[PDB]
Design a protein around this ligand. Structure first.
Ligand SMILES: CC(C)C[C@@]1(C(=O)O)C[C@H](C(=O)O)[C@H](c2cccs2)N1C(=O)c1ccc(C(F)(F)F)cc1
Ligand SMILES: CC(C)C[C@@]1(C(=O)O)C[C@H](C(=O)O)[C@H](c2cccs2)N1C(=O)c1ccc(C(F)(F)F)cc1
Length: 557
């Protein structure tokens, strides 16, 4: 069966699209090599269409059904609640795409009589009809990258009224089921610190550790009707209200398994028979299906003492090495099993015996030292894409502030501290916009965050030591330095100088502003202050930040 079929109508934009890096008076201070930064546009949709369109075959064996039985036994212990219309409305992002039916994201959030009545009638239709495919819009995403050019990614989503209904039937399920099912292998339950801790403690629990990441080529396209019906059977093990069972069956048949594709102008583009990337279950569905295939593939491969780490389509395995020749042979069998299961690799998997050389979720463990000289593991990544996007965001307001999400997720890193913090605090100060709440995304969900709150956020997520890491690894330093030469970003010595200034500028204003000065930029002074817990930190509500992923899920936290 083919992942998609097309009519030959084009995937169309719904607004002006820029591909070329916009330049303003601030650009050059961050990045000189402008022509290396670009955004994807609908003009490359055609190329993406060819990549994501193929035939899927699937051959399911006893290892597969064995892991599924287990997954189902654990799912059966979950009790999930239906959300009210009101609860589902408050989870809607203020800037979520409006409905074709005369109300938008703000009408929903306000419980306007029109939004609510439409939601009620879409809900009602879900209960009455488990057959008619639900319409979706297919769009090309505008995303910013550094060259070496990718084609636009595609997003496929139903109407707003449908999205609210999805939250009602499934929010509690997608938030609570995957950790019950997958235990410590479910990646989205951890903050980046907790994730590094889980990986180190897993690497260490092996006599002779071996690990690998596994990248499925176009994972969403590899998701078959079988896979999506199997996800449905797992959801349906939960102790649910009968009305919820019905809405879930309905959304599965009419939306999750497939449906017609419509462009921004109302033309039929074709039909989908694979994972929709802009539905509530995209993340949970991908995590379960990836975990189910991979667990069964470990058994086929006879890997010893496997520990998986799964975040949607992103997969890490750590196990007991059987020796280097045996390990390489085992990975080949794993890949064969994965592929029979319909999930062939993009890049063939490579066994690693060094934890820091495994990249998953584009990220890796590394080490630096705290104030006391002690070893600290933290999560980092290649900064090329973060810096490319910071340049873009320097010159344009965008819906999502990746610079802010990167500061939060990668606060302990040399590149987030020296460059991202320094640059954006200078920009914010000069506009007196430190208090202005900004939208960013973390594990796919949307958050509205005042820069002035960064210090307490970072402390909670990463702890105090994030403000005093130093003595980064040669490998990390070399990768950062190499990325700055590529993009023509000023060298770290310039950034320290700038940070002193930005730091001095912030200390003046006192209050929260001075706290950012003191905590964020303490690395920039020769004689470091002492950093002590910030009071307003445990007063903040952060539980609920790392419970589940919601990539494509239209979730506001
Ligand atoms: C500011 C970004 C860090 C936010 C972004 C998001 O999901 O919306 C987008 C990121 C991306 O495009 O690499 C990242 C990921 C999303 C999906 C896989 S990795 N994102 C993450 O939140 C993320 C950061 C770190 C990790 C890790 F490595 F801790 F598991 C997983 C996911
Ligand atoms: C090879 C040098 C780049 C290493 C040096 C060291 O002592 O550890 C010396 C630096 C110094 O001159 O301040 C710096 C620091 C050491 C202790 C606090 S900051 N160091 C750093 O490694 C460092 C550079 C940059 C950052 C930043 F900005 F990301 F916080 C933190 C730490």
């Amino acid at each position: 069966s083919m992942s998609y079929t097309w009519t030959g109508a084009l995937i169309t934009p719904c607004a002006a699209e820029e591909s070329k890096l916009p330049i303003n008076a601030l650009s050059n201070s961050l990045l000189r090599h402008h022509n290396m930064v670009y955004a994807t546009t609908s003009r490359s949709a055609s190329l993406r269409q060819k990549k994501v369109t193929f035939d899927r075959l699937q051959v399911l064996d006893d290892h597969y059904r064995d892991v599924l039985k287990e997954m189902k036994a654990k799912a059966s212990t979950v009790k999930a609640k239906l959300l009210s219309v009101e609860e589902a409305c408050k989870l809607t992002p203020p800037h979520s795409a409006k409905s074709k039916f005369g109300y938008g994201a703000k009408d929903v959030r306000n419980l306007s009589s029109k939004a609510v009545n439409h939601i009620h009638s879409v809900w009602k239709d879900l209960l009455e009809d488990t057959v008619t495919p639900i319409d979706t819009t297919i769009m090309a995403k505008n995303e910013v990258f550094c060259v070496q050019r990718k084609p636009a990614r595609l997003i496929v989503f139903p109407d707003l009224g449908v999205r609210v209904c999805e939250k009602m039937a499934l929010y509690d399920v997608v938030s609570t089921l995957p950790q019950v099912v997958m235990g410590s292998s479910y990646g989205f339950q951890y903050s980046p610190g907790q994730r590094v801790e889980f990986l180190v403690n897993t690497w260490k629990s092996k006599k002779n550790p071996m690990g690998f990441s596994y990248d499925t080529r176009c994972f969403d396209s590899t998701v078959t009707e079988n896979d999506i019906r199997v996800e449905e059977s797992i959801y349906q093990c939960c102790d649910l209200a009968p009305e919820a069972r019905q809405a879930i069956k309905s959304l599965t048949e009419r939306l999750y398994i497939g449906g017609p594709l419509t462009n921004s102008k109302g033309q039929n583009c074709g039909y989908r028979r694979c994972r929709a990337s802009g539905v509530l279950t995209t993340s949970c569905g991908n995590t379960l299906t990836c975990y189910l295939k991979a667990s069964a593939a470990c058994r086929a491969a006879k890997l010893q003492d496997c520990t998986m780490l799964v975040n949607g389509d992103d997969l890490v395995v750590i196990c007991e090495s059987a020796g280097v020749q045996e390990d390489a042979a085992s990975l080949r069998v794993f890949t064969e099993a994965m592929t029979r299961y319909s999930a062939p690799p993009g890049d063939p998997p490579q066994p690693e015996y060094d934890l820091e050389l495994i990249t998953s979720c584009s990220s890796n463990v590394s080490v630096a030292h705290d104030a006391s000289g002690k070893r600290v593991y933290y999560l980092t990544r290649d900064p090329t894409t973060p810096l490319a996007r910071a340049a873009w965001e320097t010159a344009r307001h965008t819906p999502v502030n990746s610079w802010l999400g990167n500061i939060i997720m990668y606060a302990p890193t040399l590149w987030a501290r020296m460059i991202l913090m320094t640059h954006f605090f200078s920009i914010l100060l000069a506009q007196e916009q430190l208090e202005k709440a900004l939208d960013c995304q973390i594990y796919g969900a949307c958050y509205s965050i005042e820069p002035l709150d960064l210090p307490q956020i970072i402390e909670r997520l990463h702890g105090l030591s994030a403000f005093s890491l130093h003595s980064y690894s040669p490998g990390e330093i070399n990768r950062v330095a190499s990325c700055l030469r590529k993009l023509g970003v000023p060298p770290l010595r310039v950034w320290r100088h700038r940070a002193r200034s930005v730091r001095a500028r912030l200390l003046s204003q006192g209050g929260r502003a001075a706290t950012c000065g003191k905590y964020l930029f303490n690395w920039a002074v020769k004689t470091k202050l002492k950093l002590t817990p910030i009071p307003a930190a445990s007063q903040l509500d952060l539980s609920s930040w790392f419970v589940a992923g919601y990539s494509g899920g239209d979730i506001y936290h």
